[PDB]
């Protein structure tokens, strides 16, 4: 649900 | 700088962004969009060392898919520049970074198609179809469709393949609940509404069918492009910071007239 900011 | 003390140290320098939007819709019986807007907030949770210069970049179109803010207030820490850059030294922990509104190019995650048939004056035949409109790899959660029933309602029969539904007589509505549902799908509910007799003269003012849902994207179209951290004293670069974002889009008022 939190994902990395790419 | 009275919102952040000066001593702060973490080995694990990490932040989290929550983009939280409530999407609002009023739809005509013949699919026209009568009214729609999004209200959003970005909340930041920062566990960063020292006093750092953060720069928040999004897919603002004034600056691919790019989006249109009608207006927004910021948190005092934000340096008001009109290059339209968002600059701040954040408070520690959690705070609201910005609040915003959008009216244009909104993704309406759900389409509701109602169909109603009168059967003499003894019953109503109702079919409702919902369509998820968004990437198939994404699931909506916590979907409720609320179908209002008239006051002269003897009783209610419903079939649905997905979900569970109950007639809730005190609330004068059928309530269909679905745990999960993926993008680019259809589901339907059929219901038969048994009527009591009533003053033929006064007609039924059919209130809208409303929905609630939660979706893991921003209906405004907002995407976070970067969050840049520079602390010029201390010895950690931007690429040392662990960065996270999540999106939680929820229905506000989301009403479709039948």
Short mmCIF file of C-alpha atoms in Angstrom, two decimals:
data_model
loop_
_atom_site.label_atom_id
_atom_site.label_comp_id
_atom_site.label_asym_id
_atom_site.label_seq_id
_atom_site.Cartn_x
_atom_site.Cartn_y
_atom_site.Cartn_z
CA UNK A 1 0.00 0.00 0.00
CA UNK A 2 2.96 2.41 0.68
CA UNK A 3 5.12 2.14 -2.46
CA UNK A 4 8.52 3.70 -3.21
CA UNK A 5 8.63 7.13 -4.81
CA UNK A 6 10.55 6.39 -7.99
CA UNK B 1 11.68 28.16 12.85
CA UNK B 2 9.28 27.42 15.67
CA UNK B 3 7.72 24.25 14.18
CA UNK B 4 11.01 22.22 14.31
CA UNK B 5 13.67 21.94 17.10
CA UNK B 6 17.35 21.78 16.18
CA UNK B 7 18.73 18.52 17.75
CA UNK B 8 17.24 15.86 15.50
CA UNK B 9 19.00 12.63 14.49
CA UNK B 10 17.88 9.29 13.00
CA UNK B 11 20.05 6.50 11.49
CA UNK B 12 17.08 5.51 9.44
CA UNK B 13 16.04 8.71 7.60
CA UNK B 14 12.68 8.01 6.20
CA UNK B 15 9.53 9.71 5.09
CA UNK B 16 6.04 8.78 4.14
CA UNK B 17 3.51 10.69 2.02
CA UNK B 18 -0.22 10.08 2.18
CA UNK B 19 -2.28 11.64 -0.61
CA UNK B 20 -5.80 11.56 0.69
CA UNK B 21 -8.66 12.56 -1.52
CA UNK B 22 -12.34 12.52 -1.30
CA UNK B 23 -14.10 12.40 -4.67
CA UNK B 24 -17.59 13.88 -5.14
CA UNK B 25 -20.06 13.32 -7.94
CA UNK B 26 -23.62 14.07 -8.94
CA UNK B 27 -24.67 12.18 -12.06
CA UNK B 28 -27.88 12.55 -14.14
CA UNK B 29 -30.11 9.56 -15.01
CA UNK B 30 -28.82 9.63 -18.60
CA UNK B 31 -25.07 9.55 -17.57
CA UNK B 32 -24.26 13.37 -17.65
CA UNK B 33 -21.88 14.66 -15.02
CA UNK B 34 -23.90 17.37 -13.28
CA UNK B 35 -21.24 18.20 -10.62
CA UNK B 36 -17.94 16.82 -9.54
CA UNK B 37 -14.94 17.84 -7.52
CA UNK B 38 -12.10 16.39 -5.45
CA UNK B 39 -10.85 17.68 -2.04
CA UNK B 40 -7.41 16.47 -1.15
CA UNK B 41 -4.66 16.64 1.46
CA UNK B 42 -1.11 15.57 1.41
CA UNK B 43 0.12 14.48 4.86
CA UNK B 44 3.84 14.04 5.39
CA UNK B 45 5.48 11.86 8.03
CA UNK B 46 9.17 12.77 8.10
CA UNK B 47 11.83 11.11 10.22
CA UNK B 48 14.79 13.09 8.95
CA UNK B 49 17.98 14.35 10.48
CA UNK B 50 18.78 17.96 11.25
CA UNK B 51 17.01 20.83 9.45
CA UNK B 52 16.50 19.78 5.85
CA UNK B 53 15.35 21.59 2.69
CA UNK B 54 12.56 19.51 1.27
CA UNK B 55 11.18 20.11 -2.23
CA UNK B 56 7.82 18.43 -3.13
CA UNK B 57 7.19 17.75 -6.81
CA UNK B 58 3.90 16.57 -8.32
CA UNK B 59 2.36 16.31 -11.76
CA UNK B 60 1.00 19.79 -11.58
CA UNK B 61 0.38 20.88 -15.15
CA UNK B 62 1.53 24.54 -14.78
CA UNK B 63 4.86 22.86 -13.52
CA UNK B 64 2.78 12.37 -19.42
CA UNK B 65 -0.55 12.76 -17.36
CA UNK B 66 -0.45 16.27 -15.61
CA UNK B 67 -3.23 17.86 -13.45
CA UNK B 68 -5.10 20.96 -12.60
CA UNK B 69 -5.36 22.50 -9.19
CA UNK B 70 -8.14 25.06 -8.72
CA UNK B 71 -6.58 26.15 -5.42
CA UNK B 72 -4.74 25.15 -2.32
CA UNK B 73 -3.57 26.36 1.05
CA UNK B 74 -0.18 25.25 2.53
CA UNK B 75 1.37 24.69 5.92
CA UNK B 76 3.26 27.68 7.31
CA UNK B 77 6.60 26.00 6.61
CA UNK B 78 6.00 26.44 2.87
CA UNK B 79 7.98 29.06 0.96
CA UNK B 80 5.48 30.87 -1.31
CA UNK B 81 7.08 31.28 -4.70
CA UNK B 82 5.18 31.96 -8.03
CA UNK B 83 8.09 29.25 -9.95
CA UNK B 84 5.38 27.11 -8.26
CA UNK B 85 7.99 25.04 -6.36
CA UNK B 86 7.01 23.64 -3.00
CA UNK B 87 9.83 24.34 -0.50
CA UNK B 88 9.92 23.81 3.19
CA UNK B 89 11.79 22.56 6.17
CA UNK B 90 9.23 20.20 7.55
CA UNK B 91 8.12 19.72 11.11
CA UNK B 92 9.18 16.42 12.60
CA UNK B 93 6.81 13.51 12.43
CA UNK B 94 3.44 14.00 10.97
CA UNK B 95 1.88 17.10 9.52
CA UNK B 96 -0.46 18.34 6.78
CA UNK B 97 1.65 19.74 3.99
CA UNK B 98 -1.14 20.92 1.67
CA UNK B 99 -4.83 20.93 1.14
CA UNK B 100 -6.29 21.24 -2.42
CA UNK B 101 -9.31 21.27 -4.70
CA UNK B 102 -9.81 19.96 -8.24
CA UNK B 103 -12.79 20.11 -10.65
CA UNK B 104 -11.32 19.10 -14.03
CA UNK B 105 -10.25 15.77 -15.56
CA UNK B 106 -11.33 13.78 -12.54
CA UNK B 107 -11.24 10.05 -12.69
CA UNK B 108 -14.67 8.80 -11.62
CA UNK B 109 -13.77 5.37 -10.34
CA UNK B 110 -17.28 4.02 -10.54
CA UNK B 111 -20.11 4.24 -12.97
CA UNK B 112 -23.58 3.35 -11.71
CA UNK B 113 -26.26 2.28 -14.23
CA UNK B 114 -29.73 2.00 -12.77
CA UNK B 115 -32.82 0.48 -14.39
CA UNK B 116 -36.33 0.59 -12.90
CA UNK B 117 -39.56 -1.07 -14.04
CA UNK B 118 -43.01 -0.62 -12.56
CA UNK B 119 -45.12 -3.75 -12.41
CA UNK B 120 -48.71 -2.60 -12.17
CA UNK B 121 -48.76 -0.92 -8.82
CA UNK B 122 -47.85 -3.95 -6.78
CA UNK B 123 -44.00 -4.12 -7.33
CA UNK B 124 -40.77 -2.53 -8.69
CA UNK B 125 -38.15 -4.34 -10.70
CA UNK B 126 -34.69 -2.83 -10.12
CA UNK B 127 -31.39 -3.59 -11.68
CA UNK B 128 -28.21 -1.82 -10.86
CA UNK B 129 -24.85 -2.27 -12.52
CA UNK B 130 -21.60 -0.88 -11.31
CA UNK B 131 -18.50 -0.52 -13.48
CA UNK B 132 -14.99 -0.08 -12.13
CA UNK B 133 -13.08 2.39 -14.17
CA UNK B 134 -9.36 2.09 -13.42
CA UNK B 135 -6.23 -0.05 -13.90
CA UNK B 136 -7.13 -3.79 -13.55
CA UNK B 137 -4.07 -4.38 -11.32
CA UNK B 138 -5.75 -2.10 -8.71
CA UNK B 139 -8.47 -3.17 -6.30
CA UNK B 140 -11.13 -1.02 -4.75
CA UNK B 141 -12.05 -1.88 -1.19
CA UNK B 142 -15.11 -1.23 0.97
CA UNK B 143 -17.72 -0.77 -1.70
CA UNK B 144 -21.25 -0.06 -0.65
CA UNK B 145 -24.12 0.74 -2.97
CA UNK B 146 -27.17 2.07 -1.34
CA UNK B 147 -30.48 1.80 -3.29
CA UNK B 148 -33.34 3.70 -1.79
CA UNK B 149 -36.78 2.12 -1.51
CA UNK B 150 -40.20 3.84 -1.21
CA UNK B 151 -42.04 4.12 2.09
CA UNK B 152 -44.84 1.78 0.97
CA UNK B 153 -42.47 -1.19 0.82
CA UNK B 154 -44.00 -4.49 1.89
CA UNK B 155 -40.74 -6.36 1.42
CA UNK B 156 -37.72 -6.84 -0.81
CA UNK B 157 -36.18 -9.64 -2.91
CA UNK B 158 -32.56 -9.38 -4.06
CA UNK B 159 -30.08 -11.44 -6.03
CA UNK B 160 -26.46 -10.55 -6.46
CA UNK B 161 -23.58 -12.75 -7.54
CA UNK B 162 -20.89 -10.63 -5.95
CA UNK B 163 -21.26 -9.27 -2.45
CA UNK B 164 -23.94 -9.45 0.24
CA UNK B 165 -27.04 -7.28 0.31
CA UNK B 166 -29.74 -6.54 2.94
CA UNK B 167 -32.98 -4.48 2.84
CA UNK B 168 -32.71 -2.17 5.79
CA UNK B 169 -36.31 -1.10 6.44
CA UNK B 170 -35.74 1.59 9.01
CA UNK B 171 -33.26 3.21 6.65
CA UNK B 172 -35.58 2.64 3.60
CA UNK B 173 -32.75 1.29 1.47
CA UNK B 174 -31.14 -1.82 0.02
CA UNK B 175 -27.48 -1.98 0.91
CA UNK B 176 -25.09 -3.99 -1.22
CA UNK B 177 -21.59 -4.44 0.10
CA UNK B 178 -18.58 -5.73 -1.76
CA UNK B 179 -15.22 -6.39 -0.03
CA UNK B 180 -12.95 -6.05 -3.10
CA UNK B 181 -13.30 -5.22 -6.77
CA UNK B 182 -10.80 -4.74 -9.55
CA UNK B 183 -10.49 -2.24 -12.30
CA UNK B 184 -12.33 -2.56 -15.58
CA UNK B 185 -15.11 -4.87 -14.21
CA UNK B 186 -18.94 -5.00 -14.01
CA UNK B 187 -21.26 -6.29 -11.32
CA UNK B 188 -24.92 -6.19 -11.01
CA UNK B 189 -27.68 -6.51 -8.47
CA UNK B 190 -31.30 -7.34 -9.15
CA UNK B 191 -34.05 -6.55 -6.72
CA UNK B 192 -37.79 -6.87 -6.70
CA UNK B 193 -39.62 -4.48 -4.46
CA UNK B 194 -42.98 -5.53 -3.09
CA UNK B 195 -45.28 -2.50 -2.66
CA UNK B 196 -48.22 -1.74 -0.27
CA UNK B 197 -51.02 0.28 -1.74
CA UNK B 198 -50.86 3.98 -1.23
CA UNK B 199 -52.35 7.25 -2.24
CA UNK B 200 -52.09 6.86 -6.11
CA UNK B 201 -51.95 10.71 -6.39
CA UNK B 202 -48.70 11.51 -4.51
CA UNK B 203 -45.89 10.02 -6.80
CA UNK B 204 -42.39 8.74 -5.59
CA UNK B 205 -39.50 11.28 -5.61
CA UNK B 206 -36.73 8.68 -6.39
CA UNK B 207 -33.65 9.71 -4.38
CA UNK B 208 -30.24 8.94 -5.90
CA UNK B 209 -28.32 5.75 -5.61
CA UNK B 210 -25.17 6.46 -3.70
CA UNK B 211 -21.92 4.63 -3.33
CA UNK B 212 -19.06 4.43 -0.95
CA UNK B 213 -15.70 3.06 -1.84
CA UNK B 214 -12.04 3.39 -1.22
CA UNK B 215 -9.40 3.23 -4.02
CA UNK B 216 -5.62 3.18 -4.02
CA UNK B 217 -5.09 6.11 -6.34
CA UNK B 218 -5.94 9.83 -6.48
CA UNK B 219 -9.02 10.55 -8.51
CA UNK B 220 -7.67 14.06 -9.22
CA UNK B 221 -4.95 12.42 -11.20
CA UNK B 222 -2.25 13.52 -8.85
CA UNK B 223 0.96 11.58 -8.87
CA UNK B 224 3.98 12.42 -6.73
CA UNK B 225 7.05 12.85 -8.91
CA UNK B 226 9.68 13.52 -6.23
CA UNK B 227 10.39 14.58 -2.69
CA UNK B 228 13.90 15.99 -2.53
CA UNK B 229 15.84 16.24 0.68
CA UNK B 230 18.99 18.36 1.12
CA UNK B 231 20.58 18.85 4.52
CA UNK B 232 23.66 20.87 3.95
CA UNK B 233 25.47 20.39 7.39
CA UNK B 234 24.93 16.63 7.88
CA UNK B 235 26.41 13.87 5.83
CA UNK B 236 23.48 12.19 4.23
CA UNK B 237 22.45 12.76 0.64
CA UNK B 238 18.95 12.68 -0.86
CA UNK B 239 19.50 9.05 -2.08
CA UNK B 240 20.08 7.91 1.50
CA UNK B 241 16.55 8.79 2.46
CA UNK B 242 13.96 6.09 2.30
CA UNK B 243 10.85 7.41 0.60
CA UNK B 244 7.26 6.16 0.46
CA UNK B 245 3.98 7.27 -0.87
CA UNK B 246 0.43 6.00 -0.71
CA UNK B 247 -2.83 7.05 -2.19
CA UNK B 248 -6.21 6.72 -0.54
CA UNK B 249 -9.12 7.99 -2.59
CA UNK B 250 -12.54 7.77 -0.99
CA UNK B 251 -16.04 8.66 -1.99
CA UNK B 252 -17.56 11.81 -0.63
CA UNK B 253 -21.00 12.42 -1.97
CA UNK B 254 -21.21 10.09 -4.96
CA UNK B 255 -24.78 10.04 -6.15
CA UNK B 256 -26.36 8.85 -9.33
CA UNK B 257 -29.96 9.82 -10.07
CA UNK B 258 -32.38 7.21 -11.34
#
